[PDB]
Amino acid sequence: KNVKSKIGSTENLKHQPGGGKVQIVYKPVDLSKVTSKCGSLGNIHHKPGGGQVEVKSEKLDFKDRVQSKIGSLDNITHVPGGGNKKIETHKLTF
């Protein structure tokens, strides 16, 4: 069991604001094969090129305003537990 409650609250929540989440996996596999039997070869030049990976974030401008106004919280009964009995809240004004 999982219970979450909010009454009259204010939240500002951000995950990785500026640059975000970046995940890069670089795993090329090379299985080239040169074979010779009973013959003649010249020179071998094995010169394969590597990859380029680039991730960039240049000129970001992020601006937030959060405002909350409540006149009054009063006379609240909040029972997220179980098996309770005879819970009371009273208010009187003259």
| Residue 2 exposure: Cα atoms within 13 Å on the Cβ side | 0
| Residue 60 exposure: Cα atoms within 13 Å on the Cβ side | 9
* Burial class of residue 57, CB neighbours in 10 A (0-12, 13-18, 19+): exposed
SS3 content of the chain, % helix, strand, coil (to 5): 0, 0, 100
Two tokens at 71?
A: 């006149």
CA–CA distances in Å: residue 12 to residues 15, 28, 67, 84: 11, 42, 11, 34
CA–CA distances in Å: residue 14 to residues 8, 54, 65: 20, 25, 14
Q: Rounded CA gap, 14 and 17, in Å? A: 6
Method: cryo-EM
Resolution (in Å) of the shown entry? 2.6
- Residue 49 neighbours by CB under 8 Å, 6+ apart: none
Q: Rounded CA gap, 67 and 70, in Å? A: 10
CA–CA distances in Å: residue 23 to residues 14, 28, 42: 19, 16, 43
